[PDB]
Short mmCIF file of C-alpha atoms and ligand atoms in Angstrom, two decimals:
data_model
loop_
_atom_site.label_atom_id
_atom_site.label_comp_id
_atom_site.label_asym_id
_atom_site.label_seq_id
_atom_site.Cartn_x
_atom_site.Cartn_y
_atom_site.Cartn_z
CA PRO I 1 -0.06 0.00 0.15
CA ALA I 2 1.33 3.57 -0.99
CA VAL I 3 -0.04 6.73 0.27
CA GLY I 4 -0.10 10.20 -1.09
CA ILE I 5 0.73 13.18 1.38
CA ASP I 6 0.09 16.84 0.79
CA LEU I 7 2.59 18.26 3.14
CA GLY I 8 1.00 21.76 3.56
CA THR I 9 2.21 24.91 5.16
CA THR I 10 -0.76 24.99 7.76
CA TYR I 11 -2.48 21.45 7.31
CA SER I 12 -1.45 18.17 5.67
CA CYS I 13 -3.58 15.68 4.11
CA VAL I 14 -3.01 11.79 3.55
CA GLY I 15 -4.90 9.68 0.92
CA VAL I 16 -4.85 6.00 -0.18
CA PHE I 17 -6.15 4.62 -3.40
CA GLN I 18 -7.75 1.32 -2.84
CA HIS I 19 -10.62 -0.70 -4.35
CA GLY I 20 -10.69 1.57 -7.32
CA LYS I 21 -11.13 4.92 -5.48
CA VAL I 22 -9.15 7.37 -3.24
CA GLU I 23 -9.98 7.52 0.40
CA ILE I 24 -8.94 10.72 2.03
CA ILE I 25 -7.90 9.45 5.46
CA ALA I 26 -9.23 10.74 8.81
CA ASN I 27 -6.87 11.34 11.74
CA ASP I 28 -7.47 10.11 15.31
CA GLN I 29 -9.63 13.01 15.84
CA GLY I 30 -11.84 12.22 12.85
CA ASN I 31 -10.28 15.14 10.82
CA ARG I 32 -9.41 14.67 6.96
CA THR I 33 -6.57 17.44 7.47
CA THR I 34 -4.11 17.60 10.16
CA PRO I 35 -2.25 20.83 11.26
CA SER I 36 1.33 21.00 10.32
CA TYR I 37 2.34 21.79 14.00
CA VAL I 38 4.64 20.22 16.51
CA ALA I 39 4.91 21.07 20.01
CA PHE I 40 7.29 20.14 22.85
CA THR I 41 6.29 19.97 26.52
CA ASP I 42 7.89 19.15 29.84
CA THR I 43 6.76 15.58 29.26
CA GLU I 44 6.10 14.89 25.58
CA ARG I 45 6.07 15.72 21.81
CA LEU I 46 2.65 16.67 20.53
CA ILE I 47 1.90 16.49 16.64
CA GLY I 48 -1.02 17.84 14.60
CA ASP I 49 -4.47 18.84 16.30
CA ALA I 50 -3.12 18.19 19.88
CA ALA I 51 0.00 20.66 18.98
CA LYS I 52 -2.26 23.35 17.50
CA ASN I 53 -4.94 23.11 20.41
CA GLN I 54 -2.27 24.17 22.98
CA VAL I 55 -0.56 26.70 21.14
CA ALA I 56 -1.89 29.58 23.45
CA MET I 57 -0.53 27.89 26.48
CA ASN I 58 2.84 27.01 25.09
CA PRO I 59 3.71 29.41 21.86
CA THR I 60 7.56 29.35 22.15
CA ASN I 61 7.66 25.56 22.12
CA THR I 62 5.10 25.16 19.33
CA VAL I 63 6.47 24.96 15.72
CA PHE I 64 4.49 25.67 12.64
CA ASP I 65 5.13 27.15 9.09
CA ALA I 66 8.26 24.98 8.73
CA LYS I 67 7.53 24.68 4.92
CA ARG I 68 8.36 28.33 4.56
CA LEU I 69 11.87 27.37 6.10
CA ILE I 70 12.45 24.01 4.71
CA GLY I 71 15.58 23.83 2.25
CA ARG I 72 16.15 27.61 2.69
CA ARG I 73 19.31 29.71 3.84
CA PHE I 74 19.06 31.54 7.16
CA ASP I 75 19.59 34.75 5.11
CA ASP I 76 16.96 33.83 2.60
CA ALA I 77 14.61 36.81 2.33
CA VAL I 78 11.72 34.59 2.94
CA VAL I 79 13.25 33.40 6.27
CA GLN I 80 14.08 36.60 7.28
CA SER I 81 10.68 38.06 6.84
CA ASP I 82 8.40 35.37 8.46
CA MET I 83 10.79 35.20 11.26
CA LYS I 84 9.42 38.42 12.60
CA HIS I 85 6.14 36.78 13.43
CA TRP I 86 7.16 33.35 14.77
CA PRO I 87 7.03 32.91 18.54
CA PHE I 88 9.42 30.02 18.45
CA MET I 89 13.21 30.71 18.32
CA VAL I 90 15.09 30.17 14.84
CA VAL I 91 18.81 29.91 15.35
CA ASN I 92 21.54 30.21 12.72
CA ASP I 93 23.73 27.08 12.17
CA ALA I 94 26.35 27.77 9.98
CA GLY I 95 24.00 29.73 7.44
CA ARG I 96 21.00 27.24 7.70
CA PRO I 97 18.05 27.52 10.08
CA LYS I 98 17.36 25.24 12.96
CA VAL I 99 14.52 25.80 15.26
CA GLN I 100 15.31 25.74 19.02
CA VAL I 101 12.73 24.68 21.73
CA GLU I 102 12.64 23.68 25.31
CA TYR I 103 11.76 19.86 25.55
CA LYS I 104 11.51 17.75 28.61
CA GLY I 105 12.92 20.80 30.24
CA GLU I 106 16.23 20.37 28.02
CA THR I 107 16.89 22.76 25.21
CA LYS I 108 16.96 21.08 21.88
CA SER I 109 17.56 22.22 18.35
CA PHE I 110 15.97 20.90 15.00
CA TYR I 111 16.47 21.22 11.21
CA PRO I 112 13.34 22.37 9.44
CA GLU I 113 13.27 18.87 7.62
CA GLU I 114 13.44 17.14 11.03
CA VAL I 115 10.23 18.94 12.09
CA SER I 116 8.77 18.36 8.70
CA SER I 117 9.69 14.59 9.30
CA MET I 118 7.63 14.60 12.56
CA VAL I 119 4.57 16.03 10.56
CA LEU I 120 5.19 13.27 8.03
CA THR I 121 5.66 10.67 10.95
CA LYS I 122 2.21 11.75 11.96
CA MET I 123 0.60 11.35 8.50
CA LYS I 124 2.42 7.78 8.32
CA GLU I 125 0.83 6.76 11.48
CA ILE I 126 -2.48 8.37 10.51
CA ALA I 127 -2.47 5.93 7.33
CA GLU I 128 -1.29 2.80 9.42
CA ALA I 129 -4.12 3.33 12.06
CA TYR I 130 -6.92 3.52 9.40
CA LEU I 131 -5.47 0.58 7.31
CA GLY I 132 -4.09 -1.73 9.95
CA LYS I 133 -0.97 -2.29 8.00
CA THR I 134 2.62 -1.07 7.75
CA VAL I 135 2.87 1.88 5.31
CA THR I 136 6.13 2.74 3.92
CA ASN I 137 5.63 3.80 0.22
CA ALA I 138 4.59 7.46 -0.42
CA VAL I 139 4.24 10.27 -2.80
CA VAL I 140 5.02 13.74 -1.24
CA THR I 141 3.95 16.84 -2.95
CA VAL I 142 5.86 20.21 -3.09
CA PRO I 143 4.97 23.60 -4.46
CA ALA I 144 5.93 23.97 -8.26
CA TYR I 145 8.40 26.93 -7.43
CA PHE I 146 10.35 24.79 -5.00
CA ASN I 147 14.20 24.63 -5.89
CA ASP I 148 16.66 21.64 -5.54
CA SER I 149 17.36 22.28 -2.04
CA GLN I 150 13.68 22.55 -0.99
CA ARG I 151 12.71 19.31 -3.01
CA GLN I 152 15.70 17.38 -1.45
CA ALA I 153 15.13 18.52 2.13
CA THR I 154 11.41 17.39 1.73
CA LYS I 155 12.30 14.12 0.32
CA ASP I 156 14.81 13.93 3.31
CA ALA I 157 11.95 14.59 5.82
CA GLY I 158 10.30 11.52 4.41
CA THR I 159 13.31 9.28 4.70
CA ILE I 160 13.73 10.20 8.30
CA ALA I 161 9.95 9.75 8.93
CA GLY I 162 10.69 5.94 7.51
CA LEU I 163 9.14 6.41 4.20
CA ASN I 164 9.90 5.27 0.82
CA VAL I 165 9.42 8.33 -1.15
CA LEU I 166 8.37 7.16 -4.41
CA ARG I 167 8.39 10.64 -6.05
CA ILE I 168 8.30 14.32 -5.07
CA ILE I 169 5.40 15.41 -7.25
CA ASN I 170 4.33 19.20 -7.84
CA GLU I 171 1.15 20.19 -5.98
CA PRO I 172 -0.28 21.51 -9.09
CA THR I 173 0.45 18.46 -11.11
CA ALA I 174 -1.19 16.29 -8.33
CA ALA I 175 -4.19 18.42 -8.56
CA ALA I 176 -4.28 17.85 -12.28
CA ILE I 177 -3.82 14.04 -11.99
CA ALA I 178 -6.83 14.05 -9.25
CA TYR I 179 -9.05 15.25 -11.98
CA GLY I 180 -7.47 12.82 -14.55
CA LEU I 181 -6.57 15.85 -16.82
CA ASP I 182 -3.42 13.49 -17.93
CA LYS I 183 -5.58 10.77 -19.41
CA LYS I 184 -6.84 13.35 -22.23
CA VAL I 185 -5.57 12.55 -25.60
CA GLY I 186 -4.15 14.30 -28.79
CA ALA I 187 -3.23 17.90 -28.72
CA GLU I 188 -1.04 19.71 -25.91
CA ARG I 189 -3.50 21.27 -23.27
CA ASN I 190 -2.70 24.20 -21.17
CA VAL I 191 -3.93 23.94 -17.45
CA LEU I 192 -4.18 26.87 -14.84
CA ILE I 193 -4.17 25.82 -11.29
CA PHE I 194 -5.51 28.44 -8.80
CA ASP I 195 -4.63 27.70 -5.23
CA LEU I 196 -6.11 29.91 -2.54
CA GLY I 197 -5.65 28.80 1.00
CA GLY I 198 -5.85 30.48 4.41
CA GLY I 199 -2.73 32.33 4.13
CA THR I 200 -1.30 31.76 0.61
CA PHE I 201 -2.24 32.39 -3.10
CA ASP I 202 -0.49 30.14 -5.73
CA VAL I 203 -1.13 30.20 -9.42
CA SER I 204 0.55 27.44 -11.81
CA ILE I 205 0.34 27.01 -15.51
CA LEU I 206 1.31 23.53 -16.80
CA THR I 207 1.29 21.89 -20.10
CA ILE I 208 -0.19 18.08 -20.54
CA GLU I 209 0.46 16.16 -23.66
CA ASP I 210 -0.16 12.48 -23.69
CA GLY I 211 0.09 12.34 -19.93
CA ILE I 212 3.49 14.15 -19.86
CA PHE I 213 3.63 17.23 -17.68
CA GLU I 214 5.62 20.42 -17.92
CA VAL I 215 5.62 23.59 -15.62
CA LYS I 216 5.26 26.74 -17.87
CA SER I 217 4.94 29.40 -15.24
CA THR I 218 4.30 30.11 -11.31
CA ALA I 219 2.77 33.20 -9.63
CA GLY I 220 1.13 34.34 -6.54
CA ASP I 221 0.78 36.47 -3.48
CA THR I 222 2.47 34.77 -0.52
CA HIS I 223 0.39 36.63 1.93
CA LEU I 224 -3.28 36.51 0.55
CA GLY I 225 -5.55 34.17 1.75
CA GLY I 226 -8.96 33.42 3.69
CA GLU I 227 -7.41 35.03 6.83
CA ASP I 228 -7.43 38.40 4.88
CA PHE I 229 -11.27 37.87 4.30
CA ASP I 230 -11.69 37.40 7.91
CA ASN I 231 -9.96 40.40 8.82
CA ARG I 232 -12.38 42.48 6.43
CA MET I 233 -15.38 41.06 8.24
CA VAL I 234 -13.92 41.71 11.78
CA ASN I 235 -13.36 45.36 10.63
CA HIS I 236 -16.90 45.67 9.49
CA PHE I 237 -18.40 44.28 12.57
CA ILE I 238 -16.06 46.22 15.19
CA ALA I 239 -17.33 49.35 13.29
CA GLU I 240 -20.95 48.29 13.70
CA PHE I 241 -20.56 47.68 17.27
CA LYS I 242 -19.09 51.17 17.50
CA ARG I 243 -21.97 52.50 15.56
CA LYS I 244 -24.99 50.85 17.75
CA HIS I 245 -23.18 50.84 21.21
CA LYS I 246 -20.39 53.71 21.07
CA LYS I 247 -17.96 51.21 22.32
CA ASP I 248 -14.57 49.88 20.96
CA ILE I 249 -14.23 46.20 21.39
CA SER I 250 -10.83 46.10 19.70
CA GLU I 251 -8.43 46.04 22.76
CA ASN I 252 -10.26 43.48 24.32
CA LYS I 253 -8.35 40.27 22.88
CA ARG I 254 -11.17 37.70 23.97
CA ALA I 255 -13.84 39.54 22.57
CA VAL I 256 -11.97 40.04 19.16
CA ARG I 257 -11.18 36.32 19.22
CA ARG I 258 -14.99 35.52 19.62
CA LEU I 259 -15.82 37.85 16.75
CA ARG I 260 -13.15 36.41 14.73
CA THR I 261 -14.08 32.72 15.02
CA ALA I 262 -17.40 33.72 14.35
CA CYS I 263 -16.73 35.68 11.34
CA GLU I 264 -14.70 32.85 9.68
CA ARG I 265 -17.40 30.46 10.31
CA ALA I 266 -20.10 32.84 8.81
CA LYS I 267 -17.82 33.12 5.65
CA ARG I 268 -17.91 29.26 5.17
CA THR I 269 -21.91 29.44 5.63
CA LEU I 270 -21.69 32.55 3.02
CA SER I 271 -20.18 29.94 0.34
CA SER I 272 -23.77 27.82 0.35
CA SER I 273 -26.11 30.26 1.54
CA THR I 274 -26.67 33.95 0.90
CA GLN I 275 -26.98 35.23 4.45
CA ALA I 276 -25.28 34.39 7.86
CA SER I 277 -26.42 35.13 11.45
CA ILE I 278 -24.37 35.63 14.48
CA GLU I 279 -25.28 35.71 18.06
CA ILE I 280 -22.45 36.60 20.58
CA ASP I 281 -23.82 36.86 24.13
CA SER I 282 -21.99 39.46 26.27
CA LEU I 283 -19.29 40.23 23.79
CA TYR I 284 -18.06 43.40 25.32
CA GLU I 285 -18.92 45.16 28.70
CA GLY I 286 -21.96 42.63 29.07
CA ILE I 287 -23.37 43.95 25.79
CA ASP I 288 -24.73 41.18 23.37
CA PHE I 289 -23.88 41.39 19.66
CA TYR I 290 -26.51 39.85 17.25
CA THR I 291 -26.05 40.67 13.83
CA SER I 292 -26.18 39.41 10.17
CA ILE I 293 -24.37 39.57 6.87
CA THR I 294 -25.48 38.88 3.41
CA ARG I 295 -23.26 37.25 0.81
CA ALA I 296 -23.27 40.39 -1.21
CA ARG I 297 -22.09 42.55 1.80
CA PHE I 298 -19.38 39.85 2.21
CA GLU I 299 -18.36 40.18 -1.42
CA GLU I 300 -18.52 44.20 -1.19
CA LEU I 301 -16.21 44.11 1.89
CA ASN I 302 -13.64 42.09 0.03
CA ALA I 303 -14.04 43.39 -3.58
CA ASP I 304 -10.52 44.64 -4.19
CA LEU I 305 -8.98 41.41 -2.50
CA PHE I 306 -11.20 39.17 -4.80
CA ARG I 307 -10.60 40.95 -8.02
CA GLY I 308 -6.89 41.18 -7.14
CA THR I 309 -6.45 37.45 -7.32
CA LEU I 310 -6.69 37.96 -11.24
CA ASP I 311 -3.42 39.79 -11.43
CA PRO I 312 -1.16 36.60 -10.64
CA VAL I 313 -3.33 34.99 -13.21
CA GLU I 314 -2.31 37.50 -15.89
CA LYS I 315 1.37 37.26 -14.66
CA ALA I 316 1.41 33.68 -15.17
CA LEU I 317 -0.30 33.93 -18.55
CA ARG I 318 2.50 36.46 -19.44
CA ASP I 319 5.31 34.38 -18.34
CA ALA I 320 4.09 31.10 -19.98
CA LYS I 321 3.42 33.43 -23.19
CA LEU I 322 -0.06 32.22 -23.42
CA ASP I 323 -3.21 34.10 -24.15
CA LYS I 324 -6.17 33.47 -21.60
CA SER I 325 -8.02 31.75 -24.72
CA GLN I 326 -5.31 29.02 -24.60
CA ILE I 327 -6.26 27.79 -21.42
CA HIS I 328 -8.04 24.37 -21.74
CA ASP I 329 -8.55 23.41 -18.15
CA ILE I 330 -8.58 25.43 -14.88
CA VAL I 331 -8.43 23.49 -11.51
CA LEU I 332 -9.50 24.91 -7.98
CA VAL I 333 -7.17 24.19 -4.96
CA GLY I 334 -7.38 25.44 -1.23
CA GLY I 335 -10.46 26.17 0.94
CA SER I 336 -10.89 29.48 -0.16
CA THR I 337 -11.82 28.64 -3.67
CA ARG I 338 -15.36 27.59 -2.21
CA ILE I 339 -16.21 31.21 -2.44
CA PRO I 340 -18.87 31.73 -5.28
CA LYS I 341 -17.71 35.38 -6.20
CA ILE I 342 -13.75 34.07 -6.63
CA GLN I 343 -15.37 31.29 -8.83
CA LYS I 344 -17.29 33.95 -10.92
CA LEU I 345 -14.54 36.20 -11.45
CA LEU I 346 -12.34 33.35 -12.74
CA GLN I 347 -15.23 31.59 -14.58
CA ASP I 348 -15.81 35.12 -16.30
CA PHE I 349 -12.25 36.07 -16.74
CA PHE I 350 -11.90 33.16 -18.88
CA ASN I 351 -14.80 34.10 -21.01
CA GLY I 352 -17.07 31.73 -19.05
CA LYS I 353 -14.77 28.73 -19.30
CA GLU I 354 -15.80 25.72 -16.84
CA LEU I 355 -13.82 24.86 -13.69
CA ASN I 356 -12.70 21.60 -12.29
CA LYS I 357 -13.98 21.92 -8.64
CA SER I 358 -15.71 18.56 -7.81
CA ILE I 359 -13.06 17.28 -5.58
CA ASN I 360 -12.92 18.86 -2.22
CA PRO I 361 -10.30 21.62 -2.78
CA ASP I 362 -8.51 21.07 0.62
CA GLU I 363 -8.05 17.26 -0.75
CA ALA I 364 -7.18 17.39 -4.20
CA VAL I 365 -3.50 17.45 -3.90
CA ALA I 366 -3.53 14.42 -1.59
CA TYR I 367 -5.87 12.87 -3.82
CA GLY I 368 -3.87 13.15 -7.10
CA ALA I 369 -0.68 12.11 -4.95
CA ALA I 370 -2.54 8.85 -3.70
CA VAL I 371 -3.54 8.12 -7.43
CA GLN I 372 0.05 8.56 -8.48
CA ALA I 373 1.28 6.56 -5.48
CA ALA I 374 -0.65 3.56 -6.42
CA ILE I 375 0.62 3.72 -9.99
CA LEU I 376 4.23 3.98 -8.73
CA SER I 377 4.15 1.22 -6.35
N1 3BH Z 1 -16.52 26.87 2.53
C1 3BH Z 1 -15.55 27.85 2.70
N2 3BH Z 1 -15.79 29.22 2.20
C2 3BH Z 1 -14.82 30.34 2.21
N3 3BH Z 1 -13.74 29.82 2.95
C3 3BH Z 1 -13.27 28.48 3.10
C4 3BH Z 1 -14.38 27.46 3.23
N4 3BH Z 1 -13.74 26.34 3.57
C5 3BH Z 1 -12.55 26.62 4.00
N5 3BH Z 1 -11.83 25.85 4.57
N6 3BH Z 1 -12.16 28.05 3.76
C6 3BH Z 1 -11.13 28.73 3.93
O1 3BH Z 1 -9.76 28.28 3.53
C7 3BH Z 1 -8.78 28.34 4.30
C8 3BH Z 1 -7.99 27.12 4.74
O2 3BH Z 1 -8.95 26.36 5.22
C9 3BH Z 1 -9.33 29.27 5.70
O3 3BH Z 1 -9.11 30.64 5.36
C10 3BH Z 1 -10.94 28.74 5.72
O4 3BH Z 1 -11.64 29.96 6.27
#
């Protein structure tokens, strides 16, 4: 048995192709994705949901975003920038980062691939728990923009985890494979993959001919995601609370958290209904906050951000020397692509071209990796 693993920046996903169909595997908590989080305590190492859950109680010993570090030099522009907002320590070991933590009271240091190997170990165990079998063979995916060093450190993270990494496959290729875009025949096709998650936006153009892939271009915005959309909702409701109660809730961290959690939940509802209601009792100074938001108001609050996703798309086309008419297939990846307005902007931009969106966009990369893993095994 071989598994496909989407090793994601914030969440990871494992699938297995068995009995003619991909099964996306639920973890011990019943979650079909697992936070890419590792935490070190006085007594134990926590990975996944258990790690994410205690981040507030232990921020400096709880590691995430290791994929932003993996295979990079310490002085990489990216390593330097994201370092500013990570509560965990990143030390410089002869030009390449290690994370330093306190573990069983004893101060310990880890290469980014050692941390990623821990996440991969979790995904491996998640697979073994479901199957009741040993799992060694895996396909692991990476972003299309990853260099040799980033790809090799990812493969290494797997080997340390005890995986036999059959192949490192690009995430947009795996997404394409999930939709069987590689089974189409005759003429060369151009495929755009639109990947919008919680934090990041990635665009890729590939060519496929007779099931042979090539990456043509990549573009994006490394800080545009559903988290930005939540911010606009929060700002909207803080102003509303100010308007109706002449009270500023924004310096109360717990009130703002309640609102924000409520906001991202409402956002998800707005992807399948046209209004969402929120009741938060005793939000600030004992004042209840009952409110509602239409899909249209949500769209209005995010108008610039939503339209702005089209710019990396134009860039990707430019760099691939392709006209928007020369795109044959469009594939949706990432949770934020569930937004109808985003789908309409993309569906319209391509003159009304259809979209591959039937596979759960959170799971499509693991899906394709799992299909490829069974073929390669
Ligand atoms: N149905 C939905 N509508 C809008 N956004 C959704 C969404 N589902 C998810 N996960 N998201 C967002 O995807 C990101 C990664 O999970 C987060 O920003 C989620 O809110």
